[PDB]
Ligand binder design. Sequence first.
Ligand SMILES: [Ca+2]
Ligand SMILES: [Ca+2]
Ligand SMILES: [K+]
Ligand SMILES: [K+]
Ligand SMILES: [K+]
Ligand SMILES: [K+]
Ligand SMILES: [K+]
Ligand SMILES: [Mg+2]
Ligand SMILES: [Mg+2]
Lengths: 732, 372
Amino acid sequence: VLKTSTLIRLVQLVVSFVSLWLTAAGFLHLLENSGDPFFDFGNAQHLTYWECLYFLMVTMSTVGFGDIFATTVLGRTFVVIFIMIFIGLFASFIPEIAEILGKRQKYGGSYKKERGKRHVVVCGYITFDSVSNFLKDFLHKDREDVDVEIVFLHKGLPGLELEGLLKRHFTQVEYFWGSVMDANDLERVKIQEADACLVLANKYCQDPDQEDAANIMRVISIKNYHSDIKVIVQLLQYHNKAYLLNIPSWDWKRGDDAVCVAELKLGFIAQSCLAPGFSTLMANLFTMRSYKPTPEMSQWQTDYMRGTGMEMYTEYLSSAFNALTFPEAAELCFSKLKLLLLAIEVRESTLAINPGPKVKIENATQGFFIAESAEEVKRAFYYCKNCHANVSDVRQIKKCKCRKFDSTGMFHWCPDRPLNDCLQDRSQASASGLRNHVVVCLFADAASPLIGLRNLVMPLRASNFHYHELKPTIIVGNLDYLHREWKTLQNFPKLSILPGSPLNRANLRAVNINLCDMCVIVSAKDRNMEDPNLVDKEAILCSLNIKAMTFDDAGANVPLITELANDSNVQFLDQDDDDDPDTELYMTQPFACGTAFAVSVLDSLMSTSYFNDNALTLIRTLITGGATPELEQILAEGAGMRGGYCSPAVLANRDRCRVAQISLFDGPLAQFGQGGHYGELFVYALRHFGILCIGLYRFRDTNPSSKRYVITNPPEDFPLLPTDQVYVLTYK
Amino acid sequence: RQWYSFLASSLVTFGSGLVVIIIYRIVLWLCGWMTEAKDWAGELISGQTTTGRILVGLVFLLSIASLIIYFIDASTNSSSTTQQVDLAFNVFFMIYFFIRFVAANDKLWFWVELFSFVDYFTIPPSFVAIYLDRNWLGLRFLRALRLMSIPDILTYLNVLKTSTLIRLVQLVVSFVSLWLTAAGFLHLLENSGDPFFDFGNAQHLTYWECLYFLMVTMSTVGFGDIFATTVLGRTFVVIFIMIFIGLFASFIPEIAEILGKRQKYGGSYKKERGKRHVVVCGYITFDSVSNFLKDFLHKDREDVDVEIVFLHKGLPGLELEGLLKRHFTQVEYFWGSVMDANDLERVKIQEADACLVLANKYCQDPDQEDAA
Ligand SMILES: [Ca+2]
Ligand SMILES: [Ca+2]
Ligand SMILES: [K+]
Ligand SMILES: [K+]
Ligand SMILES: [K+]
Ligand SMILES: [K+]
Ligand SMILES: [K+]
Ligand SMILES: [Mg+2]
Ligand SMILES: [Mg+2]
């Protein structure tokens, strides 16, 4: 009848205790009532058997009321023996029962599904920090208020902070014990009926390979249980993404997005090398924020914090936009509705970013907007040319009543090379007249794991750029490390590797870091293996070393961007600002100016991949420079990049929209920088050139350090300066 | 049949209440409002909406106020200010009882919950009391279990933050509620007596005497100043002894750990006008400081009024504490690292003269020490 060690130990504990307690009671019942032969059976207090149980449990527990006591000689000698023994039983009896009856797992049961409500199964790394970041993005005021429950399936029992968070979000969120590997725990959660499944990941760990290996197995166990299901995964290393693409059930078509952190992280940084500060333009568009201007802030901060409140949104355009060109449509969204229209999905649904006048708007077209909230974008859905054409107040539109190339033709390809062709010393690097280029200051041991600098270099070598226009990249690190990554990196032109650490000024002066477009600082070393303060020692010391240097033909004017493991270590980068660890990473001066880029800002990207399936694949076109699924399956087949010369049909895919900065100092746009506003600039640039002004990169000090800060989609009436730089989607 | 009338009124609600929903789990076994009211009632109880925070805030205060009426009535022992106002609390709680019935997922499993049980033994006898014109304590003491929701109530409002304060409030309130209920359970059994001997034996303890009695037997002191004479009372004491010793054994030591975690050498360095000071930091032990203070504070140097401020992460040892106290006027010790900018405003390093970073010379490796 008894199975498991707990129930056998429990029954042994209870029954042995009860039997011995009952016998001892009866032994006193004998001795007390009989008396003793020492005094001719004279002394004999008349206790019942039931009075002796009360007496013994009391003396066993070491309470000892003295309400009943032993008068007899033989009885008292038994009490002395009883006291020595049964205190020993009672001391181990109750605590061991408490351990056995405490082991019942609390958050068991099973998720009972309601009819109309659809739900999501979150799993993997689930702590207070991972969930609190997730629930702020997923459950938020700005999104369309859809009834979507969340179900946290997890092995461990939750902490006291997490329990409080789960109780505050009572109606939506529910927590459940058990792993994703057991098929019984999936029938429990009802993942078959569920909409999607989100595998979160521990970014800060001992090694990333064991973490992703678990998350890959989590996917396999879900797909083994049921094939037709959306599974979104948070991976860390890019080479681990090849394993998910070779699972047969894993289908790209139905929205199985592997949110690879290293692909995006370096991609965001790579686009900053082309147009500085773009790293923190895009990072703010995906964290769901709201504008709360406190009076302590200065002029530059309040304009930045408005930019944080803008986000990506998908919503259908009204019938007013039908039979109408793109630039005229994007103008109506900006001028009247006050919404920045980026892209329109055209019915295989192609995702065209900022097309010219040829691409018309069909009926029921999904438009991609940058706006303050989802309900603000809903003004596009309720627009009418007959009714709303004379209304200046925009809140009144609530009325519903109306050379070598890759096989894909996306990147600049090369034939395979050995490392010694692209290797350089301090003599050869200084001989090469390097200017307007990228410098990857790479910190790594020989044994340290791969980042995939391939993901940094790839978007720099996009087919949008001509061969002469490409910014020549110089990586600075170990040969032992880069010998691994050379397998992937070999098929990229204008790439140069220089050995030694980038802390040495002799290395940097040979590179000409003073004449650098963007010096990217990366650390491949193990993240959190010792302390939180000593993690970004190399990353901070390299940035401070470059700021401190002076050149003689430009010290602090060297533009650089630092990857960070810790968010709190952002304060040590810049030397002139107010620092508080209470203040979040996005509000800090180094981040706002595109000098820093932590990984933590991409926690929100797991939520957006669920809600807006196309919003994730939008930015992969805009960031990596056309990383098509076609490429991912070619790379999964294992022979690296390939191509040749290619046909003119394939090479007509060089035309897509890259990001670029336009300074308002020279050229035709300079007239607007003197006196006029941002709204006047946007309309003039759109008609003539085919340009969508996303935001500004304005100087912090204007009254002098050269630190510029991001302003994503400012108001219509926002004054410009002649020193400003404007982010733009081009057709050049 | 006084004990039978008030006790049956609770069991009639509980007993016939299962018959209501057993019918609806057989009728549907053979085979809007369920979704909308459930989500509305959940937001109301969970304290998310500001209208919900009124009901959460009232259930906090009204539960304590209803328990105060029991203490006042049970202390002394047709229509008075104590009895008639008690309905205002019970009529409020029966509305709160129907709201939870809507909010919960399982409907049959709701009727066998703790707070659902509390409602059956508290609310019907209070209505029957004015119907029958008889004040009976009976099972009023179970109003102490309404305190148990305070850890939930405060986490619904987000007053409690950090794991220490949530664990502390859970420890204190659960202990106090269970200790108050147990006292009232004896107060019933001791004063009522028992049906074994026709309610003959019945020692007249107050509710307050039972608290003193239980805390004593809970603590394993057992004076025998007050004791249990009754059969049902003694059986409760045997059960109480087996359980509440287990609570009391883990209650006090875990509170000692929580109230011991307050860091002693906190505060902030208050700077005098003329005196300038120095911020010593890094490796700070008895050996490093004692060598430093012999050189820095010495007879041979020019006697300049220079205070020393030891900013350090760790809590100092017993030898170091004695050394810091001997040098009372000059030397001061402070918790917190040099990395946190709040701990620098604390020490006032901006106004300070210098900062001395000491180093552990004898270590596992020198590179990690210098890196710090
Ligand atoms: Ca917003
Ligand atoms: Ca700083
Ligand atoms: K004792
Ligand atoms: K004792
Ligand atoms: K005693
Ligand atoms: K005693
Ligand atoms: K006595
Ligand atoms: Mg629910
Ligand atoms: Mg002083």
